[PDB]
Write a protein that binds this ligand. Structure first.
Ligand SMILES: Nc1ncnc2c1ncn2[C@@H]1O[C@H](COP(=O)(O)OP(=O)(O)OP(=O)(O)O)[C@@H](O)[C@H]1O
Ligand code: FES
Ligand code: FES
Ligand SMILES: [Mg+2]
Length: 271
């Protein structure tokens, strides 16, 4: 049955490249997936759809000026490995905040019957907060699992710890949990020991260390994932091991965050 996962983490650390490459690896082995992009600039489905950008629900509900008058085939397009793609977007030419844009997007999907019988995973590519609008990708009938993409810097780790605070302070005792820390590389073999040390302190795991490799940039100027553009690359096998690890994961925790006194100690021990 449908496991609903959501990717959180800091700005610019690699959530949409890790999400799309993980999903491509999942589709390659047989899993049936839907990516729902929860970012104002539609860029969560480009490497799967080979699109310039996908046409958002919030640019087909203000364009068509609807209330309840829009079709699912106009926002759910299939791409590589048969992955289904939805793009929420913001009121990006309009006015306001995103957040709520995700709410009037997975409610649309629910109403239009997008969550079908043979779907294995639904990945939401959200942002930096498990609060309100951006947390209804985590509500009662929604995502059970959260994976935080982070790295060796102070601000990526601080973001992981604060997202983790938002997960313990998820509304009422339903069941939104932390599945692990995906470390997206930036240094060498001391950075992985830093993320493992934070993870053990939060009560999770570093479910995979993703290397920094230029094939990623080569694949995406060509609008693809590394699994599609270059299946035999060592990096492709990195997202397939992350994909295997997420598929077998049974360590959904209710995290135990550290104080800023403690994160500074960990960071001081390293850089
Ligand atoms: N493993 C990697 N190897 C090489 N480059 C990478 C890797 N992971 C991410 N990148 C690159 O670093 C950048 C970060 O990726 P991306 O923009 O998808 O992160 P993001 O957190 O989703 O961004 P945002 O905060 O805007 O939502 C991109 O330019 C991407 O190509
Ligand atoms: S509107 Fe947040
Ligand atoms: S609105 Fe957090
Ligand atoms: Mg992104």
């Amino acid at each position: 049955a449908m496991r609903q996962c959501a990717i959180y983490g800091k700005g610019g650390i690699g959530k949409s490249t890790t999400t799309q490459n993980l999903v491509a690896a999942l589709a390659e082995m047989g899993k049936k997936v839907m990516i729902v992009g929860c970012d104002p600039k539609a860029d969560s489905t480009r490497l799967i759809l080979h699109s310039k950008a996908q046409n958002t629900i919030m640019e087909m509900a203000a364009e068509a000026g609807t209330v309840e008058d829009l079709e699912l085939e106009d926002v759910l397009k299939a791409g590589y490995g048969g992955v289904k793609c939805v793009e929420s977007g913001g009121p990006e030419p309009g006015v306001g905040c995103a957040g709520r844009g995700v709410i009037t997007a997975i409610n649309f999907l629910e109403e239009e019957g997008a969550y079908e019988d043979d779907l294995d995973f639904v990945f939401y590519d959200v942002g930096d907060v498990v609060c309100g609008g951006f947390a209804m990708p985590i509500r009662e009938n929604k995502a059970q699992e959260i994976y935080i993409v982070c790295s060796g810097e102070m601000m990526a780790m601080y973001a992981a710890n604060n997202i983790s605070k938002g997960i313990v302070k998820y509304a009422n005792s339903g069941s939104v949990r932390l599945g692990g820390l995906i470390c997206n590389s930036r240094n060498t073999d001391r950075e992985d020991e830093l993320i493992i040390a934070l993870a053990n302190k939060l009560g999770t795991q570093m479910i995979h260390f993703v290397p920094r490799d230029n094939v990623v940039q080569r694949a995406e100027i060509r609008r693809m994932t590394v699994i599609e553009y270059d299946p035999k690359a060592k990096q492709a096998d990195e997202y397939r091991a992350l994909a295997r690890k997420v598929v077998d994961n049974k360590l959904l925790v209710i995290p135990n965050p550290i104080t800023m006194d403690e994160l500074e100690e960990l960071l001081m021990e390293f850089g």
